[PDB]
């Protein structure tokens, strides 16, 4: 029953020491949680044998260089079981020490409740929101193939220094989350041979026994996708685990899924196989009882036998040696491929090739009205050729997002090629399907895996579908790029389910997400330029683009875009010491109203400054000297214009300012009717400027 | 090719029916050609199916679209709105030919995507892919639970409350994560009366689906536990109708029917392409199509009299079905006077006498109590008195306090577990780790009938369910989202879990009321107001703390119901004496407001404390009330909230202060976090002082 599943099956090399190492994992987890009084001990206990096998034996990595280019990557998607990762990091010499384990979940420690990228050496990604790690792992896998395309394409299956695996530990919760279905469905399409996922199937979650909400045959589901699926029984069946792993490595045309049936919190006599093992301290009695069962001293805590540590720390030496062997192959590769090596070096130093931005498109103020999205495609098409690290695509909307670099092929197995798209393994164009959330997660995987630069595209509205991934990117401060088109009622007839209203405010609220909304075709070009150049740091970016055509304007300025907000034209106006009478601040498709109203106000002896604000976050990060030059605090008469809610503009316009906004849902009609009906006209901007003064 | 587009007409089918079908196709083609944008393709290929469902399959009355006993239909592929419109028209539901001629124009009854309440017989707003299907699930669940309340002892199929939910889904719906989650939980709950067609048609916006979709969708459905069947060809009405009766025969598994189809049949050049999906065919293709079907290529919106006469028979059929049904209902009413009284109470949106008589109270100064604990206490107290109130949690019942004490669980008894006994007419919902599906399901429930469902998860994960939440607000229906662990207050789980931008981001959604009780009593008053429907009929997100908070002096039911009210008046005041300063706070930060009020009096500063549990309710109150609470002559204002500042600027104005958190948190206990991030009475007091000196 409970006894059948928790029976050991140790391989031939496995000594008493290995059994002690495992037992050490289990008690360290129980003690670590007991110390702080809250945490997640149960899963760490049952997964000890698996985690042990992965770090000590399965994976290629070097504990003295967690940045080693050629390392296998591990992702703990079940982020609650952070101790699983922390203890291997400690046991194997990765940088964590016993005192870090003893600091679980305390202010500023290297071991927070969920693992954080950059806080701890050896953590490949922040996880915790369930689904995210698995879905991102898919991205990592995809990136490794694309990175292979760029550095060593002609190498043979397995023979490249750039060949490695992505290992993922997922739980029931990961398996239930929609994002995982999406990412898995697409992983199969892309035949990601080097992705190997363990699913800890343990019939437990926070509401205890999973039967109350989970009846599916997950393994069959994965077979349905086109994954390589295996079922292994029992947490202690290291033999079963190791055979599954080798079977998976041998399959190179399908990502692998190994469902491992387990009893949570083994061997806690009373608490195992319960929800309580998942998310609370076991209590002193259950901890003592566990120590007795494994032959540990129930009166001491954080006990680590010298022989155990001496053994596990052998990974340091094994790692070093693997790294030294790998180095010869790499060095050989560098001599054989000086060109591609120079690229690798350019990408790792985060530099761009000379004159990469020389073909940058330009449009003349007054020329034909051009949609900011069409401008983006043109800019992408121009920079493509000059930036091999740039790839990306769309969530089934390539036509509408303008994300296909002109004359680029598609990323995928040739057997997925269609009439419209030719797929090569080292292709450039990404097709995510109608999978925005997985798209988001994938993009974080891509830039976490390596130095490539990927972007993903969909309608602004569906930033709602991918929100948890965007948030996580910002938390991680990594440089993903989300192309969001059809940014307002401007989109017209598709109606209120599609038209964004709250979206810019809600996105601007996310600490560290830069929301970039170019006023016209040239601001667009200057935007990409600033994004790729990394002028404003290394956080995520949402690039907001219109469906409908907008004027090409006078007064646009690269340097000004890169500053976030700048003066598009003062009113003439003007004299030294000549503040303007009123400041109009606008963004994206509403800057043209600011301008036209500046004309209507001069014709009435009112002198208006127009400020284009393509990125409020970049503006706010500029020093006060610059900000007060653009928005002098002595001018209180201010008007903001944006086809979105007022919420995020109040601090900027102050007590006596006005905001021309949309506070309600839209309607199914053409854009011109919509902007008119909702009062997005030069006259309304003018009239607000006038009230701004009284 | 094609044998796919080959007809298979049953034995009753006449020439007329073939004309009826053909009319659907051209009506669709013209209807899009007129306005010059839209989605014609699918509406053409789905014609036979749509025709069969409304004309024949469904039990409904086209002159009472509110008929209690009607089969419900959901077109989850919202873009093919014409498929629903044309059947509404053809079958006498209220739409006329002029409505069809008004597709996608300002204020017409036929917007781009169907809109609940805008058109008679649209059951739900759809358009964001996945939403309709996921909610259909919720509808199915509602019907079961509604049967429990009205006619439980009736026999399988013998109830007037027994009917079906039909759902048309497309490739995009099938790809979307929310669909997976919903489907998976649909099988768990064994929703015998839910029957879904999936238009498997190898086409989406990026042309041929092979570029991003290789899975065997039908297998995947078998894996869940679903009664699956495959039918081949858009024209195979016989296949379709047998599939239909097979599905109705199976009463313990939700049924799924993959229909394989050629998009935009019979458009000679545009069928089977992405261009048939989402643009106007053009004049030639339209012409060509009429020729192929024997229609005048020079006349538009042509509807033969014998066609319409035939299709309109549905009015007559619908009438008699409604009449036969009435006898059973009336029989049922005589047989069940008590349950009829409930149905009547519920339809009139009434609450039983003394329903809020047991409402919990707590004395100011008593043991610190967490606002989530207060919620469960309240829920427990009202459960017995309100049969229509059900719901549960996204695998966090223990942590959300959503189980009504002494309640049973909703599901087949065979999913029962040690912790939860499931009955068919059980009350406690177990969504598992599927927040998005949870959101869509709550919308299904309250759309389907007059029951009142709530759903629970951590505030953080409103991110996972955002597109469902937003769609609820767009429809203005009275869903309820219990969001617990509202801030850094949640402690050691860390920055992936701690909400920062969420209150602001959620407040930004037009029509979502974000209710954050200050203490256990406010919590009780909040529920009272939500269930009373005092503030209208839209969605509510109820924000609750993980950690204990003081029971405060000056809480007031009437004030909560108003959204924002005066909690205390500084001690020094005279009549017509404004306070020196106003402290406005919410939820767990009100205690700081108070405690800084004491520190400010001890310094001869007279401060008003305003609790603002719901800013949207406060904003909806007349200015007389608002100015009574927040007199415009007092500029010296301070807001306090453990979230971002964004939503608070308009309220505190130019010279006010905001005590906010502008960055991500940290993994430590809650007291350390509030201290480190400046959430103390002193910091509130110091900010009051600066405001005065501005
Ligand atoms: C999207 C999301 N929803 C909810 C949570 C809260 N949560 C953390 S772990 C968990 C379920 C635990 O079950 P399982 O995934 O089986 O992990 P186990 O305890 O077996 O290792 C939940 C609901 C979360 N982190 N992310
Ligand atoms: C969540 C979401 N993402 C994207 C869209 C935009 N969109 C509308 S339909 C569609 C895909 C069209 O293909 P499919 O659903 O298979 O419809 P078909 O052409 O077969 O009728 C997309 C991406 C949407 N409406 N909702
Ligand atoms: Mg589990
Ligand atoms: Mg399709």
Author numbering:
A (entry chain A): 6 to 699
B (entry chain C): 7 to 700
Which lines from the publication concern this structure?
non-oxidative branch of the PPP, has been identified in M. TKT enzyme (Rv1449) can convert sedoheptulose-7-phosphate to D-ribose-5-phosphate. mass of 70–75 kDa, with the homodimer being the active entity.
mycobacterial species have not yet been reported.
